[PDB]
Amino acid sequence: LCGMVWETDYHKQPWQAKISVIRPSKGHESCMGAVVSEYFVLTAAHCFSIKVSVGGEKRDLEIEVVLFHPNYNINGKKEAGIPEFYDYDVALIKLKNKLKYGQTIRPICLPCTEGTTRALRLPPTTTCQQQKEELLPAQDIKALFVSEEEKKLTRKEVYIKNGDKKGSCERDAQYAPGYDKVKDISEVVTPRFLCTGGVSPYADPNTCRGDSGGPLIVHKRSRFIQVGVISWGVVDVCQVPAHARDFHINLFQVLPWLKEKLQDEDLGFL
Numbered sequence: 001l002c003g004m005v006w007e008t009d010y011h012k013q014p015w016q017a018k019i020s021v022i023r024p025s026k027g028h029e030s031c032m033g034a035v036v037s038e039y040f041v042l043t044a045a046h047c048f049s050i051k052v053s054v055g056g057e058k059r060d061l062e063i064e065v066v067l068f069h070p071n072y073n074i075n076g077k078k079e080a081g082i083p084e085f086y087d088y089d090v091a092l093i094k095l096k097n098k099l100k101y102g103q104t105i106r107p108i109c110l111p112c113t114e115g116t117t118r119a120l121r122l123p124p125t126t127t128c129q130q131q132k133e134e135l136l137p138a139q140d141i142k143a144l145f146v147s148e149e150e151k152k153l154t155r156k157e158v159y160i161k162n163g164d165k166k167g168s169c170e171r172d173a174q175y176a177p178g179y180d181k182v183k184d185i186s187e188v189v190t191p192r193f194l195c196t197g198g199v200s201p202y203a204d205p206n207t208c209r210g211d212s213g214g215p216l217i218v219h220k221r222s223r224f225i226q227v228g229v230i231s232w233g234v235v236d237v238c239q240v241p242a243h244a245r246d247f248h249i250n251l252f253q254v255l256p257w258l259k260e261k262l263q264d265e266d267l268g269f270l
């Protein structure tokens with residue numbers, strides 16, 4: 001029973017995971033993640049000694065393995081003079097021990113699962129396509145992501161540009177660090193990416209580096225479905241141009257991988 005809260009930072013966002021990598025050159029790097037099953041946290045590949053915690057605990061959970069998307073390659077396009085390439089920027093952290101679900105630790109819904117079909121009160125014949133059409137229609141989609149302000153968790157409302165504004169949102173990748181000399185923007189914005197940020201239709205807050213890996217969520221029918229993983233932004237805000245966009249891995253585009261790694265988690269992938 002995923003994507004559900006009850007009547008308190010990690011009470012209100014119980015799927016949220018905080019990640020620290022303490023790298024032997026004395027600078028701690030931060031990321032976020034979402035609990036997706038009792039053994040797994042979903043996050044970004046580019047976040048990677050490693051400290052993971054859930055439920056706002058001081059405790060750091062014991063990590064078994066970290067699984068990376070086979071097509072992820074930050075260096076994939078250096079030859080073409082593209083410094084960092086974020087295609088397939090997703091990773092699963094497998095925990096050694098079963099998480100105990102509580103009021104501070106609950107899993108979020110993933111796309112193309114029974115959990116999501118139930119959460120959206122859809123019929124048993126609901127297909128993966130129909131879910132995508134409900135959750136990601138061709139328009140501006142109200143969504144949120146979860147951030148850290150002053151060591152507490154805060155929701156921030158954003159709009160995915162997936163209709164008439166999509167192109168405008170993607171083109172703005174030209175202003176990101178290192179992409180200013182890219183001829184074809186689709187070399188860096190692949191069909192794996194959703195796009196938020198900018199001022200139309202509303203003035204969306206932007207992600208910080210430390211928000212990377214955290215879920216991009218749709219709040220629908222009183223449930224929380226994860227639609228994307230925060231990957232990269234155009235400007236580090238933490239004067240904000242109207243071309244400050246954020247890009248997220250669309251989870252509907254990495255399902256072969258998700259299904260395979262999570263095949264034993266009773267998520268009921270379609």
Ligand SMILES: Cc1cc(Br)c(Nc2ncc[nH]2)c2c(Cl)c[nH]c12
Binds near residue numbers: 178207236
């Ligand atoms: C969350 C986040 C990640 C990364 Br990586 C950034 N950097 C960047 N974008 C293109 C090449 N590197 C940013 C920026 Cl910039 C703002 N927010 C970011």
